[PDB]
Amino acid sequence: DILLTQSPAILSVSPGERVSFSCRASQSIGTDIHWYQQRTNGSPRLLIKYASESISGIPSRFSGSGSGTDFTLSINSVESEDIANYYCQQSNRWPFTFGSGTKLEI
Amino acid sequence: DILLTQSPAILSVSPGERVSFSCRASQSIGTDIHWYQQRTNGSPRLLIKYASESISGIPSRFSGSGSGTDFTLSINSVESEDIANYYCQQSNRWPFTFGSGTKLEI
Amino acid sequence: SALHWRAAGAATVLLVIVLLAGSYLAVLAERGAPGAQLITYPRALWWSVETATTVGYGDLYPVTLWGRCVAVVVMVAGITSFGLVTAALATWFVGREQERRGH
Amino acid sequence: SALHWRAAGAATVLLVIVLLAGSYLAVLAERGAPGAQLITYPRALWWSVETATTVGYGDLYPVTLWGRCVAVVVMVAGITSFGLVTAALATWFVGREQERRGH
Amino acid sequence: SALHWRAAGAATVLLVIVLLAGSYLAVLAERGAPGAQLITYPRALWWSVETATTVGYGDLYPVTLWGRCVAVVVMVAGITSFGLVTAALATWFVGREQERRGH
Amino acid sequence: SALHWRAAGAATVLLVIVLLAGSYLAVLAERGAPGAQLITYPRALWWSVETATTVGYGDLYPVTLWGRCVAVVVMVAGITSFGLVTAALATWFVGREQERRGH
Ligand SMILES: CCCCCCCCCCCC(=O)OC[C@H](CO)OC(=O)CCCCCCCC
Ligand SMILES: CCCCCCCCCCCC(=O)OC[C@H](CO)OC(=O)CCCCCCCC
Ligand SMILES: CCCCCCCCCCCC(=O)OC[C@H](CO)OC(=O)CCCCCCCC
Ligand SMILES: CCCCCCCCCCCC(=O)OC[C@H](CO)OC(=O)CCCCCCCC
Ligand SMILES: CCCC[N+](CCCC)(CCCC)CCCC
Ligand SMILES: CCCCCCCCCO
Ligand SMILES: CCCCCCCCCO
Ligand SMILES: CCCCCCCCCO
Ligand SMILES: CCCCCCCCCO
Ligand SMILES: CCCCCCC
Ligand SMILES: CCCCCCC
Ligand SMILES: CCCCCCC
Ligand SMILES: CCCCCCC
Ligand SMILES: [Co+2]
Ligand SMILES: [K+]
Ligand SMILES: [K+]
Ligand SMILES: [K+]
Ligand SMILES: [K+]
Ligand SMILES: [K+]
Ligand SMILES: [K+]
């Protein structure tokens, strides 16, 4: 199965700063990576699909970039409601797999 | 030739525990990996074919998973008759090659 | 009207249906096979087009028994249908040449 | 003159135009997609040739929706045009055999 | 009955036999070549199908002299046979158009 | 004798000559390009066969301008020649059906 590594596991940042979450795939997967936000006690919520595509309802703050094996979720100007766990997910090859998670800390 | 690495060489486990044997191929081989059990003084016996397919007569205890380069033989709830040497074998590319073996210890 | 053009039209509709059903069935066949890439609908439709035209880039392909049977039906239908267009054009040209000759 | 040869000539000119416009539009469609290789004009012309003839080596291929629509037009036009040449040859051979028979 | 349909039927049976013998002989030819992937029977049958239809994904291919000779026979037979179907369809359409004209 | 069979024979000889000259010229064109794999004669002949039949596995392909021009000539000649065989078969079937009808 495709291994998705997310390191660092925790990310500390000051309010209004730009933050970047990393996702690395164990093999090349074009742009078939999707990003989810999960707040404390909430269900996951899709933020970005196919590595860079916006979802409606998601703040413009959030963007994605990357292809092949290296992927980045970015937040321009972090704020409090962004405190969450962040997961990447691949749909290039069966079975779909998740990364292990990066926690965002302010 | 395709190199098949099986590490650890020996695996110690307590009865009824879940055990996982590892097989890594030096290049990508889809699912063309087969697993054999060889008890002391016995001939090898096929357990799993094409990485995850059951053989009839093998206890349901045994399963396989993986594709590409990383393969796993698993035993739910180890028991005494499982004390053996365990070998993987590839048929993706000529010539067929064997891994070096993992011994199971209880 | 003329049989050759009826058959061409019919060939084209059938091929569209084979593409669409092939996409749906390839995903069905291929999910559950570790390593399979032919597993989402939009790229499956692309894959079936490039298979019917027999272009086959190698960016996508089935790895299961049923996925591969699906693939064969798609090939045979793309080759057959395009062959039928060529046949219909040859009928058209032959009939017009008989005329131009006064036959 | 004869319809089959007119159509062959016309098929060939159309195909050349499809190759050229396909190259230009494939680059247009594909730039802005991370990972896309089909992004400079000279290799795009090569890519469209190997797609029209349906050879498809897999050294290059579109990854976007529009790039792939472009690809489909190119395939259909290469297959169609070469089919039309075969049709025109069959008309030629059939007419000459009618003669050789005295019909 | 009619020659074109007899030949089509015959083409199809021959092609099935070429696929099967090609699979068996490709494995024979290719085992003993380090690195060869065309070495088990089920994927060899798939490989020969995708070669006969000329789809050629590139997931499998021979690397030896004899494997490649085998491959050539399979190509020629798939192209030839499918060509023969097109020919038979053109004969069918031409005959029906002669009728519809009253000729 | 009959034009269609003469042309088929001639098509086959021409194609053999194009394969052989294409192999020789592809190596010539491609040596001196860093990364090129199409650089020894035996695999070049194989490469040209799989290009003429339009199978194109992707194990080998030109990367230079002239290598790619060479490739195009080979494609056009393989497609054309095999098309000519189909044409000749359609002429054969059509003539035999005229007979079987008493025309
Ligand atoms: C069995 C049901 C089949 C349904 C398939 C429908 C797909 C078509 C449009 C949907 C829009 C979309 O979001 O896909 C484009 C995608 C953008 O992310 O990129 C893609 O590459 C899609 C490739 C599809 C290419 C098909 C070309 C065939 C002429
Ligand atoms: C929409 C506009 C299309 C314009 C394309 C024109 C390209 C042709 C000649 C330019 C010379 C050049 O510097 O290219 C050769 C290049 C050398 O660096 O190597 C290449 O590989 C170019 C490959 C092109 C192969 C095309 C073969 C088709 C018969
Ligand atoms: C010269 C003798 C040829 C014998 C070949 C017979 C193979 C067919 C069925 C056997 C079942 C099996 O276990 O194969 C399917 C396999 C499942 O492990 O996956 C596969 O991918 C097999 C691929 C075969 C695809 C062929 C499609 C052609 C229409
Ligand atoms: C322009 C001159 C062309 C000359 C080419 C002649 C090659 C043919 C025979 C020589 C024997 C040899 O040592 O090649 C086989 C090789 C064994 O090492 O393996 C190979 O893979 C050679 C592949 C050639 C496949 C061609 C199949 C076409 C029907
Ligand atoms: C330019 C396209 C021609 C490709 N054909 C037919 C197209 C199929 C949609 C492949 C048929 C082979 C089964 C002709 C063979 C070329 C040698
Ligand atoms: C031979 C083509 C029919 C499709 C075979 C089964 C479809 C997928 C089953 O899961
Ligand atoms: C269907 C072929 C027409 C091309 C589609 C759009 C061209 C590229 C747009 O950016
Ligand atoms: C030319 C096709 C006939 C097959 C050549 C030999 C078969 C494999 C020999 O080991
Ligand atoms: C267009 C085909 C003719 C070949 C072009 C030149 C041959 C290689 C030159 O080095
Ligand atoms: C079981 C019906 C077959 C579907 C057509 C395959 C494309
Ligand atoms: C919008 C016009 C289509 C261009 C032809 C595609 C090759
Ligand atoms: C020696 C007989 C040739 C077998 C047919 C090749 C597919
Ligand atoms: C300059 C002569 C062209 C050779 C034929 C290409 C295969
Ligand atoms: Co008459
Ligand atoms: K390839
Ligand atoms: K490849
Ligand atoms: K082809
Ligand atoms: K092809
Ligand atoms: K191909
Ligand atoms: K390919």
Structural features, described:
The structure is cut from a larger assembly and holds two copies of chain A (106 residues) and four copies of chain C (103 residues). In chain A, β7 and β8 form a beta hairpin. Chain A has a single domain, classed as Immunoglobulins (Immunoglobulin-like). Chain A is built from no helices and eleven strands. Chain A is mostly beta strands and 106 residues long. Chain A is globular, with a radius of gyration of 13 Å. In chain A, strands 2, 4, 5, 6, 9, 10 and 11 form a seven-stranded mixed β-sheet that branches. In chain A, 0% of the residues lie in helices and 46% in strands. Chain C is mostly helical. Chain C has one domain: Helix Hairpins. Chain C is 75% helix and 0% strand. Chain C is built from three helices and no strands. The longest helix of chain C has 37 residues. Chain C is elongated and about 65 Å long. Chain C starts with a helix and ends with a helix. One (2S)-3-hydroxy-2-(nonanoyloxy)propyl laurate sits at the interface of chains C and D. One heptane binds next to α1 and α3 of chain F.
Helicity range of chain C: over 70%
Number of strands of chain A: 11
**Morphology of chain A:** globular
Distance between the termini of chain A: 34 Å
Q: What is the largest interface, and how many residues per chain?
A: C-D, 26 and 30 residues
Beta-sheet strand percentage of chain A?
over 45%
CATH topology of chain C: Helix Hairpins
Largest sheet of chain C, in brief, is: none
Order of helices and strands of chain C: HHH
Q: Hetero groups bound?
A: (2S)-3-hydroxy-2-(nonanoyloxy)propyl laurate, tetrabutylammonium ion, nonan-1-ol, heptane, cobalt (II) ion, potassium ion
Structural class of chain C: mainly alpha
CATH topology of chain A: Immunoglobulin-like
Characterize the quaternary organization of these chains: part of a larger assembly
Intramembrane segments (chains C, D, E, F): 41-51, 52-59
Motif (Selectivity filter) (chains C, D, E, F): 54-59
Protein name (chains C, D, E, F): pH-gated potassium channel KcsA
Extracellular side (chains C, D, E, F): 30-40, 60-66
